[PDB]
Design a protein around this ligand. Structure first.
Ligand SMILES: [Mg+2]
Ligand SMILES: [Mg+2]
Ligand SMILES: [Mg+2]
Ligand SMILES: [Mg+2]
Ligand SMILES: [Mg+2]
Ligand SMILES: [Mg+2]
Ligand SMILES: [Mg+2]
Ligand SMILES: [Mg+2]
Ligand SMILES: [Mg+2]
Ligand SMILES: [Mg+2]
Ligand SMILES: [Mg+2]
Ligand SMILES: [Mg+2]
Ligand SMILES: [Mg+2]
Length: 92
RNA sequence: GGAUAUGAGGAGAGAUUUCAUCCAUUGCACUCCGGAUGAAACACCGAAGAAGUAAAUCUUUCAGGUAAAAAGGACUCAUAUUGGACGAACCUCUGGAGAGCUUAUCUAAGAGAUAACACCGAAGGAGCAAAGCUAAUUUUAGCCUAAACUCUCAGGUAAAAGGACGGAG
């Protein structure tokens, strides 16, 4: 849990369409900064989880510190900093 | 060999894609990747029954099926029962699938012979399962072991021939 561009969100409802989930997240987080991508899947290992990459660390933090435990789909969002970006930012 | 019983062997082809609920999962990734049932969308198979035919495994795929398992399974063998040894071999007719009409050379070269790679499974051919019979304690060792399974020595991948199987006198 050490400041990063990408942040990790989990304990979110495990019955949503990967597309329609990607929707709601982009809709909620874009108001904090430039959302580069929302990585999500429905694989057993990566269920009920999501990532959101920002261009600047400062947008990742302001979203984190603010949107925490926010009631989203009858689940309190649990957000925290990632491990490593692995995109245009990391290795570039 | 038939017909029921039961034990045993028995192939093909989507571990597809959407979707409804149940069972698990708090999980830190940057190829898309958990089960259990159901209901649909094309794709595919030939081995319950079924329907065309004289009948059929040929042939249609309505029903049925599409990792292993599980169930299913034309056929195959073994005990038990019933009986026919005038649907039982033999002989004639004929329906009968699969997969290279690939290249080299012999003489003239799409044919055939021979080698080569690539296959197929239905003459023929080898190998087994339960049972069976021996035998040194659950262990068990052995030999005996059907088949369209298994394999592919011979055999076959355009026609002709062949052809397990089926029916017609
Ligand atoms: Mg059986
Ligand atoms: Mg745990
Ligand atoms: Mg058939
Ligand atoms: Mg018939
Ligand atoms: Mg059908
Ligand atoms: Mg039949
Ligand atoms: Mg065969
Ligand atoms: Mg033999
Ligand atoms: Mg035996
Ligand atoms: Mg041979
Ligand atoms: Mg021919
Ligand atoms: Mg003949
Ligand atoms: Mg044979």
């Amino acid at each position: 849990t050490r400041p990063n561009h990408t942040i990790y969100i989990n304990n979110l409802n495990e019955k949503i369409k990967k597309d329609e989930l990607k929707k709601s997240l982009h809709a909620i987080f874009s108001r904090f900064g430039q959302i580069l991508d929302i990585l999500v899947s429905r694989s057993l290992k990566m269920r009920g989880q999501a990532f959101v990459i920002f261009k600047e660390v400062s947008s990742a933090t302001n979203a984190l510190r603010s949107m925490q435990g926010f009631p989203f789909y009858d689940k309190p969002m649990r957000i925290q900093y990632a491990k490593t970006d692995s995109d245009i930012i990391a290795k570039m």
